[PDB]
């Protein structure tokens, strides 16, 4: 009523996520309607968060997608942080599963090609959502899916694994209720693959009551498949809610499956016609150098990206690292000697992680790489080498690097 | 006219595959290992590493599997000492002793065009892409590699008047003193013109007249392949036999025919080179890739 | 310009009383616990004091200053920084490589790894050279062969912009 921030009047709640409360925002002169997402400043220090939510502004501000809720402006505050964001009236899509009994397979398809579309946006810009559930998905007035709620979200780096748990238990991976490293994408899959179940037969495919026994279900992946569902949506389920990573379903082979090609529009995937028309490919950056010339950048790309057989392709066994049955610390106190005699320093991060550098004696610049210990089946241990980014050869240093290291061990 | 503006505009980073494979050797590396990893791993071209010096020296071939065969080959009584116990350092120690040679690479930021005329020029069939940023090879350019890439773009850019004239009236090729083998040549007399005359492919002609194969620098490594590098005394045929069930005939190419059939032949079928022919069956030369890419480029 | 001040603490009727006013009494509306008014303020320090069921009192989690005759109020913050967003977390934000040695297990080997680019079959009708696209997680580790006659073979996949260069090294 008497509450406003930047032309707008502050009603009630929405509801709260993560971080902050989101509470309705309409317009003092002309009664739009805005959602405005309130982080307290004191709140954010107080758990270390300023670096997850500076992530969480810079991704939303450049994120531009129909099925992604929409960031207008972020006002700053001595006290709090009011992030101005779409709003949409339809609410929950987890309020239409419980109004409705079950939706139907024509319109369960239509929103699912929604999610996807939004989650493979996601990852293409190196962005894990990991907490994807129909009350994360919302719903507008035109029936369209929106992803919102990307506190528990973090970025993808190059040869960097995440472990932090985050989302629904009933909605988690098997390898997030574990506690084991995880890439990102195969996560999001599996959230998608228990949303789909959702919409199609109107409950959770691993529901109980009892925590350890819920846990066990998630582990064991076994699921009831009603009759009234298709053979063809029921073979795309069971390869979304994969145990094994490695043999679960990818963005790209849901979009080859025979149930989801069905009524998909054009314009929702980049490989798509109606593409390179309609959606912006963010080639102005590239293109910002000296009208026509953003058109050739788009014609040239899609050239080399129809020819798949001139891009990508279509004896003794090579193995990551060296192996050791040896205990832990017997591995450790064998590895801090033999970089002594080569002369090397060493940044401890953690018990079994080592960020480790050396100078080369002929070009003069510094190479670094990065060490960390992992644990195979049982009572067998694996070394792992990773080169760090930041004359010679940046490659073959790194080369020269291990080669004197496993040698020297 | 036309395909050197083209050239001129798109960068060596266009042609550069998604994913690809590269393979590099040590020069402290016995030079025996170097040619056994290069049928392993099915790569015909691989840069050299100095470790020393620290920087990229130069590039290996089949052509210093030949160089090395017909330099030290002495009997099939007798095993090649210097192929067996040899590095890299030491093979080139002697190969730079006659004249040295400054590594020829392109930077991938670098226009294509720069790109051709380092392979003619230099006379070379192999280029190196290394980033001048980082130091890093990324990958080995070819004549092949080019040729497939402007022919994804012959649609999008209007076709000259040269494209639908005859290689008779354009000339485009080597057609004086083409070196050719008979069908009982043995390897070492063969190995032997390649090293004299320069050339990549030899035509196999037989007792009655007719091209019945054609022996190239690629054919070699099968020696490595098989380990039969140590009897060079047996015939081109007997050579050839590992390849010559699955052969039909040698690709050939018409005088009348235009230049767009010519290099729609040479793509589709992935081959380096045509063998010209008059009316029925009468040889006048050989066109190949590097002839072709200078036509667009002069 | 917008300064947040919010009552955390219980009540029917709050009033906030400052700096801003002649020291005036100002209603503030209630959501459903919190008391919230959103005033217009420039750069400087600012003095405060709120008016709760008809008592003077002050906000604990705020710092506060105390007068000559034993009044508290609080203390208010308005910095440049404090309106613009990136600058706003950078405040926030604010409040080498020893040679030598330092009883849970090491974490479990994800499966990703064990996906190598090399030992996978690749069709014939294709370039030798050409690999499949790989797992961004999979990039900048190294992978090697078995020693045989007293050479290494070291492999490791890197991107340099949009495209990935395996490389392999047979250093002996
Ligand atoms: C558990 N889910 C809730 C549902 C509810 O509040 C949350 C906290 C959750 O959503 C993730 N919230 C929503 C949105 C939001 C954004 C970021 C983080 C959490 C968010 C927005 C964005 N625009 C929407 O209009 C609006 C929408 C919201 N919620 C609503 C309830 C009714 C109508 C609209 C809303
Ligand atoms: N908890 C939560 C939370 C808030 O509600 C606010 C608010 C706020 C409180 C109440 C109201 C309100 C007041 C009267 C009527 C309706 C309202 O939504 C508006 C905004 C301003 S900063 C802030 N920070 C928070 O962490
Ligand atoms: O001049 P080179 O780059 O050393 C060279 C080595 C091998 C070839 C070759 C193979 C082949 O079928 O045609 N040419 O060319
Ligand atoms: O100078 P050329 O002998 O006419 C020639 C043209 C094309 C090639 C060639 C060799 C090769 O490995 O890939 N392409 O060699």
């Known amino acids: 009523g008497r509450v406003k921030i930047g032309h707008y009047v502050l009603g009630d709640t929405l509801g709260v996520g993560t971080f902050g409360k989101v509470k309705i925002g309409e317009h003092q002169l002309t009664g739009h309607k805005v959602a405005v997402k309130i982080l307290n400043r004191q709140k954010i220090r107080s758990l270390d968060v300023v670096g997850k939510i500076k992530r969480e502004i810079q991704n939303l501000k450049l994120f531009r997608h129909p099925h992604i809720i929409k960031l207008y402006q972020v006002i700053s505050t001595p006290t709090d942080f009011f992030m101005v964001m779409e709003y949409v009236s339809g609410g929950e899509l987890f309020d239409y599963i419980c109004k409705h009994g079950r939706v139907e397979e024509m319109e369960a398809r239509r929103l699912f090609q929604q999610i996807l579309s939004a989650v493979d946006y996601c990852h293409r810009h190196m962005v894990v959502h990991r907490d994807l559930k129909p009350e994360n998905v919302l719903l507008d007035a035109h029936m369209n899916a929106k992803i919102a709620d990307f506190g528990l979200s973090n970025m993808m780096s190059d040869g960097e694994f995440l472990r932090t748990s985050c989302g629904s238990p009933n909605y988690a991976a098997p390898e997030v209720i574990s506690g084991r490293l995880y890439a990102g994408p195969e996560v999001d899959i599996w959230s998608c693959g228990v949303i789909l179940y959702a919409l199609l037969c109107g409950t959770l495919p691993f529901d109980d009551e009892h925590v350890p026994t819920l846990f066990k279900k998630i582990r064991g992946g076994v699921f009831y498949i009603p009759e009234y569902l298709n053979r063809s949506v029921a073979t795309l389920l069971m390869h979304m809610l994969q145990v094994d990573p490695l043999k679960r379903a990818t963005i790209k082979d849901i979009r080859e499956h025979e149930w989801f090609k069905q009524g998909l529009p054009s314009y929702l995937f980049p490989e798509d016609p109606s593409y390179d028309a309609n959606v912006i490919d963010d080639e102005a950056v590239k293109e910002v150098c000296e009208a026509v010339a953003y058109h050739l950048i788009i014609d040239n790309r899609r050239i080399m990206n129809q020819a798949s057989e001139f891009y990508l392709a279509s004896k003794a066994k090579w193995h990551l690292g060296i192996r050791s049955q040896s205990k832990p610390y017997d591995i450790m106190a064998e590895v801090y000697r033999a970089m002594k005699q080569l002369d090397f320093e060493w940044k401890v991060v953690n018990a079994y992680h080592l960020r480790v550098r050396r100078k080369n004696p002929v070009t003069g610049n510094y190479v670094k790489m990065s060490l960390q210990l992992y644990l195979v089946d049982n009572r067998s241990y694996l070394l792992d080498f990773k080169s760090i980014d930041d004359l010679g050869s940046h490659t073959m240093d790194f080369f020269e690097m291990c080669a004197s290291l496993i040698t020297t061990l | 006219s036309v395909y050197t503006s083209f050239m001129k505009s798109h960068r060596c980073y266009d042609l550069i595959p998604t994913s690809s494979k590269l393979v ?275 | 310009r917008p300064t947040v001040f919010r009552w955390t603490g219980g009540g029917k009727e709050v009033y906030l009383s400052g700096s801003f006013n002649n020291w005036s009494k100002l209603p503030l509306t209630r959501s459903h616990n919190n008391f919230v008014a959103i005033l217009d303020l420039p750069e400087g320090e600012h003095q405060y004091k709120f008016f709760v069921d008809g008592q003077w009192t002050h906000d604990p989690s705020e710092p506060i200053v105390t007068s000559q005759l034993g009044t508290v109020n609080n203390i208010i913050q308005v910095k440049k920084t404090d309106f613009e967003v990136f600058d706003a977390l950078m405040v926030d934000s604010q409040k080498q490589e020893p040679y030598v040695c330092k009883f849970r297990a090491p974490p479990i080997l994800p499966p990703h790894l064990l996906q190598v680019i090399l030992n996978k079959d690749t069709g014939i009708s294709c370039d030798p050279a050409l690999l499949p696209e790989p797992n961004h997680v999979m990039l900048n580790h190294l992978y090697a062969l078995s020693i045989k006659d007293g050479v290494m073979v070291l492999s490791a996949t890197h991107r340099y912009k949009k495209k990935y260069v395996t490389t392999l090294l047979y250093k002996p």
């Open chain 2, 24 to 298: 590099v050797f040590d020069t402290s590396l016995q030079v025996k290992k170097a040619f056994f990893a290069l049928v392993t791993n099915g790569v015909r071209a691989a840069p050299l590493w100095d470790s020393k010096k620290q920087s990229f020296v130069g590039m290996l071939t089949i052509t210093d599997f030949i160089n090395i065969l017909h330099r030290y080959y002495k009997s099939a009584l007798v095993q090649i000492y210097e192929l067996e116990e040899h590095k890299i350092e030491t093979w080139r120690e002697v190969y730079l002793q006659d004249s040295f040679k400054p590594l020829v690479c392109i930077s991938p930021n670098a226009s294509l065009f720069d790109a051709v005329s380092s392979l003619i020029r230099n006379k070379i069939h192999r280029l190196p892409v290394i980033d001048p940023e980082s130091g890093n090879t990324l990958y080995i350019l070819t004549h092949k590699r080019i040729l497939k890439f402007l022919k994804l773009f012959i649609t999008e850019f209007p076709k000259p008047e040269f494209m639908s004239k005859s290689l008779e009236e354009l000339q485009i090729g080597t057609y004086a003193n083409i070196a050719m083998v008979r069908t009982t040549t043995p390897v070492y007399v063969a190995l032997g013109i390649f090293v004299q005359h320069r050339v990549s492919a030899l035509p196999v002609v037989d007792e009655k007249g007719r091209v019945v194969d054609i022996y190239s620098k690629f054919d070699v490594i099968n020696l490595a392949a098989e380990k039969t590098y140590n009897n060079l005394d047996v015939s081109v045929t007997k050579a050839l036999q590992h390849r010559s069930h699955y052969f039909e005939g040698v690709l050939k190419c018409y005088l009348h025919e235009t230049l767009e059939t010519i290099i729609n032949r040479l793509v589709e079928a992935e081959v380096h080179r045509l063998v010209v022919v008059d009316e029925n069956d009468v040889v006048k030369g050989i066109v190949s890739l590097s002839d072709i890419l200078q036509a667009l480029v002069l």
